[PDB]
């Protein structure tokens, strides 16, 4: 029974972890029977969801994407917990190359082919007046030859504030927590030597926790903690910040997310006039030597870098150039603004960009909730519901099949992206 079942959530201070913790409580699980274990207190300061904002937008690259999007949209708009952090300003994809424009038109036609009537809230913009109509901060000279795709259900998400909102609820309900070395996963605990029955986890300080079921939602650290057999390759993307005065930020109030595949994107300034700018690239890996549990031999795994141990860290010099090019494209008036809060954000890719959400093949009672593939923060409100369904053996096949244990199903180093990720050991400047 739910009331008498104990669950351990590793990485419960992150996106998929806190979501799982939330839906356990909603399902009627006893709060004191739930134990969240994360290196950092929720919201985890090293979590990929520990950001000013993320983008919410429709994307149909896999079979479960449509239902996951519709589910999250419904909750981002109506759920009293998540609603205050969704800003529905829309999103616009632009391009001036013939291949980029070609790609816009195909993405638009892709939405139509779903047959649910997405053409009602998604429009192609073939004129310059149509573009300026939805994004008046551009100039007519700037957007000469641009074509646009406007998705109206889009917008951005107050990321860290949303995870923090879940955390406040968890603590207020009486969920037990473990931080620092007492919250840092080391290995699972087993009943016998055959290791076919998991009964808990041990942290790096030696502390042991016992429960009926364990959930591993360690994000980009998952493949370093347990042996995922190269199903997940962790990569880092980059962003920077610029600050506008209230008078400068005025022309961008309620502005749609602007995106161009050949440059990157930016989001409207927040409460403090801060604009974030990402670029567009396959990501950076960081292979460092590590022994994940389940592997008999120290493998070389892409491990996220610790900002705590490396304070001077920003990002490679190549990133500085591409971020400045993005700024020159979208916000040329601010080309003299200073960049600050340069940082790297870590995700983990699967081969087909589907999630990795499944019970461990051998470790019965041990479950995996990772494989975010750098596009899953949008699933914060609803992903935890399906993880619970997995634990109770009620996950529908459309999700269970795509999220299945699938080693040797392709190369996650390249994934669905344009190129294999380069490593930070070959990029100068970030250290
Ligand atoms: C990097 C990035 C990602 C991103 C994005 C922009 C950037 C720069 N923009 C997005 C967007 O616009 N829209 C969107 O939908 N997603 C976007 N993303 C991706 C998103 O951030 C990730 O997909 C997602 O956040 C990852 O989820 P996950 O739950 O997997 O990740 P996490 O929050 O990092 O969770 C990890 C937690 O695990 C804890 N941890 C790590 N190790 C341990 C150990 N050993 N023991 C206990 N806990 C551990 C971490 O501390 C963290 O709390």
Residues 261 and 146 in one domain: yes
Ligand 1 pocket check for 223: Cβ under 6 Å: no
How far is 220 from 348, CA to CA, in rounded Å? Answer: 5
Residues 128 and 240 in one domain: yes
How far is 128 from 31, CA to CA, in rounded Å? Answer: 55
> What angle (nearest 5°) sits at the alpha carbon of residue 219, between those of residues 213 and 220?
135
Phi, psi at 109, each rounded to 5°: -65, -25
Ligand 1 centre from 17 Cα, in Å?
A: 9
The angstrom resolution of this structure is 2.6
The structure's method of determination equals: X-ray
**Widest distance between CA atoms in the chain:** 71
Residues 294 and 400 in one domain: no
Q: What is the CATH number of the domain that holds 361?
A: 3.50.50.60
Query: Dihedral, CA atoms, 122, 127, 131, 133, nearest 10 degrees?
Result: -100
- Considering only CA atoms, which residue is closest to atom 19 of ligand 1? 374
Residues 16 and 61 in one domain: yes
Residues 44 and 192 in one domain: yes
What strands, in cross-sheet order, belong to the sheet with 54-56?
A: 54-56, 155-157, 86-87
How far is 312 from 173, CA to CA, in rounded Å? Answer: 39
Ligand 1 pocket check for 403: Cβ under 6 Å: no
- Considering only CA atoms, which residue is closest to atom 46 of ligand 1? 184
Ligand 1 pocket check for 178: Cβ under 6 Å: no
According to DSSP, the β-strands at 422-423 and 284-285 are parallel
Ligand 1 pocket check for 225: Cβ under 6 Å: yes
Residues 65 and 18 in one domain: yes
H or E element: which one contains 359? strand 356-359
How far is 382 from 74, CA to CA, in rounded Å? Answer: 10
- Considering only CA atoms, which residue is closest to atom 4 of ligand 1? 374
Ligand 1 pocket check for 209: Cβ under 6 Å: no
Residues 257 and 296 in one domain: yes
Ligand 1 pocket test, pick from 54, 170, 177, 326 with the greatest ligand atom count within 8 Å of Cβ, gives: 54
- Residue 423 CB neighbours (<10 A): 13
Residues 160 and 297 in one domain: no
Counting DSSP H helices and E strands in the chain, the numbers are: 10, 24
Ligand 1 pocket check for 92: Cβ under 6 Å: no
Q: What is the CATH number of the domain that holds 281?
A: 3.30.9.10
Ligand 1 pocket check for 10: Cβ under 6 Å: yes
How far is 330 from 252, CA to CA, in rounded Å? Answer: 12
Residues 3 and 68 in one domain: yes
How far is 131 from 146, CA to CA, in rounded Å? Answer: 8
Residues 289 and 399 in one domain: no
Ligand 1 centre from 372 Cα, in Å?
A: 8
Of 121, 177, 130, residue with least CA distance to 153: 121
Ligand 1 pocket test, pick from 377, 381, 382 with the greatest ligand atom count within 8 Å of Cβ, gives: 377
Residues 135 and 48 in one domain: no
- Considering only CA atoms, which residue is closest to atom 1 of ligand 1? 345
User: How many domains are there within the chain?
Assistant: 2
Q: Which residue has the tokens 């960009």?
A: 353
Ligand 1 pocket check for 38: Cβ under 6 Å: yes
- Considering only CA atoms, which residue is closest to atom 9 of ligand 1? 54
Residues spanned by the domain of 298: 88-153+233-350+411-431
Ligand 1 pocket test, pick from 9, 11, 22 with the greatest ligand atom count within 8 Å of Cβ, gives: 11
Query: 170-206 burial by CB neighbour count: b if 16+ within 10 A, else e?
Result: beeeebebbbeeebbbeebbbeeeebeebbbbebeee
Radius of gyration over every alpha carbon of the chain, rounded to an integer in angstroms: 22
What single string gives the DSSP state of each residue in 108-132? HHHHHTT-S-GGGSEEEE-SHHHHH
Residues 303 and 420 in one domain: yes
According to DSSP, the β-strands at 7-10 and 34-37 are parallel
How far is 377 from 248, CA to CA, in rounded Å? Answer: 29
According to DSSP, the β-strands at 34-37 and 176-178 are parallel
Ligand 1 pocket check for 292: Cβ under 6 Å: no
């Amino acid at each position: 029974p739910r009331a008498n079942t104990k669950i351990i959530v590793v990485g419960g201070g992150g996106t998929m972890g806190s979501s799982t913790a939330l839906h356990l409580l909603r399902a009627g699980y006893t709060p004191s029977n739930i134990t969240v274990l994360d290196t950092y207190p929720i919201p985890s300061a090293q979590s990929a969801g520990y950001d000013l904002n993320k983008i919410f937008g429709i994307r149909l690259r896999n079979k479960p994407d449509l239902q996951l999007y519709l589910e999250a949209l419904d909750m981002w708009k109506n759920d009293p917990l998540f609603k205050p952090f969704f800003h529905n300003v829309g999103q616009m994809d632009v391009s001036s190359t013939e291949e980029g424009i070609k790609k816009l038109r195909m993405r638009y036609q892709s939405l139509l082919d779903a047959g649910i009537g997405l053409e009602k809230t998604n429009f192609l913009l073939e004129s310059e007046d149509e573009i300026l109509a939805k994004a008046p901060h551009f100039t007519r000279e700037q957007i000469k030859g641009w074509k646009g795709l406007f998705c109206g259900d889009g917008g951005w998400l107050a990321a860290a504030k949303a995870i923090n909102a879940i955390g406040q609820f968890l603590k207020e309900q009486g969920v037990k927590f473990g931080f620092g070395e007492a919250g840092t996963f080391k290995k699972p605990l087993f009943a016998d030597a055959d290791e076919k029955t998991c009964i808990g986890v041990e942290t790096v300080d030696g502390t042991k926790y016992y429960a009926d079921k364990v959930v591993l939602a360690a994000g980009a650290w998952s493949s370093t903690l347990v042996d995922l057999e190269e199903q997940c390759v962790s990569k880092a993307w980059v962003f920077a910040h610029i600050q506008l005065t209230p008078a400068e930020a005025a022309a961008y109030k309620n502005t749609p997310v602007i995106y161009d595949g050949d440059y990157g994107f930016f989001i409207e300034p927040d409460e403090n006039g801060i604009i974030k700018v990402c670029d567009e690239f396959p990501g950076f890996t960081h292979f460092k030597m590590h022994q994940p549990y389940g592997s008999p031999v120290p493998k070389l795994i892409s491990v996220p870098r610790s900002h705590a141990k490396h304070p001077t860290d920003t990002y490679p010099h190549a990133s500085e150039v591409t971020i400045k090019k993005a700024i020159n494209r979208f916000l040329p008036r601010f080309n003299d603004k200073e960049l600050f809060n340069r940082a790297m954000c870590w995700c983990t890719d699967t081969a087909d960009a589907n999630l990795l959400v499944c019970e461990h093949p051998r470790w019965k009672g041990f479950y995996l909730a990772t494989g975010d593939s750098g596009h899953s923060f949008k699933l914060l409100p609803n992903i935890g519901k399906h993880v619970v369904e997995l634990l109770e053996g009620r996950l529908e096949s459309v999700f269970k099949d795509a999220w299945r244990w699938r080693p040797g199903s392709g190369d996650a180093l390249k994934s669905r992206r344009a190129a294999p990720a380069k490593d930070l050991a070959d990029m100068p400047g970030w250290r």
